[PDB]
Design a protein around this ligand. Structure first.
Ligand code: SAH
Lengths: 265, 265
């Protein structure tokens, strides 16, 4: 009669909360999805070993089209868990699944976990200064989406930071790198000429948040565009004007050039 | 030779990540602060029991004025942890403590935990649509803070949602309720008269996120301003223009008036 939405956290199998782990262990059935994002620091096998239960992986179609036929029937008569990377319901489509549960007469509860949305706090940028967020999507064929560029423009215009989620082909386990994202933005700039993203733009790269050894780097596009930030996932941030405290953290912790202390504050 | 900043999560001792717990258990010394937020579902005793170590609680003064005298000295020759509610670097000034660690020759690492900043996803509002955030502070003396009102105005004009952290006076055991926040906002409205926050404004209240049964309510200020949302902590949200799916969730899960289903495109 109960369905638990449980977040797995940021990077590896230990990023699930103690609460999430203990609940998952007591569930009769455990499902999971790895299409909204991936857990780059672990494997399905290691997650299963930790929970001590077999985990049935569900595809985007399994969930979006058949959640009520695959998960809910069992949840109607058993304790069922649905694991998701990060924090449950951060992904836009997940919230609606709680309505499906209600419709099916199944109670649902949410067990939170760390999300990259809040983990960016490790960049030293004040969380309250982050504005609207966006996703940089790989262009393909004759389709060249650029709305994320406008998001940066609108946030920066108001002195706000912009969190940019990078494209991920979960199924093929292919991650867009911060370098590729920078190249794309420069490409968009060359087309819109809005003066939003150039070689002189200050950016922050956060790779493998959740790991004990994440890569946190800050600097100008011209210098970071070909830098190796390590293994994915990568997150790109275009900060707005900086509070001196933010700038000093970027210099001391993220290796930012001293120049930001006078140019970006 | 190391200092770990470890988040404890939203509501109780089990909201810590497994990673955080396993590291905390092996630390030589464990410190913590409980003034940045309120964990309404646990006690110091229960936290100490789970970690299996004595925890020295620090006051805001101990941290802000003497972190480098109380914590860092021991971190030079031992493995030390500093625990905080939620995520240690979200809506706190703790990021700066990493700079103090560096100058003291102490390596620091961050272990994230669920944060209210991302937990708001449980309200059904799309996380990417949240704009700049703000804090509703208790007026004191002749000083009546109002900057949060302008944040709401700015986000709303862009169609973005506004997350409002609520004030907390840990030493006085005072935790601002959503009701008190709405009352303060109505007063600022009368002063500035910008048509930003009135009795007809739709708001969302999330109380005790992290618990299994948090209070999630949506409705007009005139109807919710005197409603009992249960024990603190509380957070208030002022949505911008809603997507149809957001409205459906607010109606089905947060008990909002079904009239909001009729979005004005
Ligand atoms: N479980 C919870 N439910 C509702 N609001 C919460 C909450 N935890 C924190 N808050 C809100 O956030 C304020 C503290 S701000 C510090 C937040 C913390 N670092 C985090 O990551 O969550 C509180 O006064 C309250 O308004």
């Amino acid at each position: 009669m109960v369905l638990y939405f449980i977040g797995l956290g940021l990077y590896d199998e230990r990023d699930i909360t103690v609460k999430g782990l203990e609940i998952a262990k007591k569930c009769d059935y455990v499902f999971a999805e790895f299409y909204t994002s991936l857990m780059a620091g672990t494997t399905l096998g290691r997650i299963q070993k930790l929970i001590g239960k077999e985990i049935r992986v569900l595809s985007r179609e399994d969930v979006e089209l058949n959640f009520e036929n695959i998960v809910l029937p069992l949840a109607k008569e058993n304790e069922v868990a649905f694991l998701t990377p990060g924090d449950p319901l951060v992904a836009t489509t997940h919230a609606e699944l709680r309505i499906r549960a209600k419709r099916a007469g199944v109670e649902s509860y949410v067990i939170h976990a760390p999300s990259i949305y809040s983990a960016v706090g490790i960049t030293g940028l004040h969380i309250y200064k982050f504005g609207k967020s966006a996703t940089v999507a790989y262009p393909e064929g004759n389709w060249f989406p650029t709305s994320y560029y406008d998001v940066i423009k609108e946030n920066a215009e108001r002195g706000l930071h912009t969190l940019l989620f990078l494209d991920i082909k979960a199924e093929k386990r292919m991650y867009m790198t911060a370098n590729e994202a920078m190249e794309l933005l420069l490409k968009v700039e060359d087309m819109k000429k809005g003066g939003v993203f150039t070689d002189d733009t200050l950016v922050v790269v956060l790779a493998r948040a959740g790991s004990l050894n994440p890569t946190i780097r800050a600097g100008y596009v011209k210098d970071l565009i070909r830098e190796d930030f390590g293994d994915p996932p990568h997150i790109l941030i275009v900060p707005g004007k900086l509070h001196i405290v933010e700038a000093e953290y970027l210099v001391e912790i993220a290796g930012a050039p001293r120049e930001i202390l006078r140019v970006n504050v």
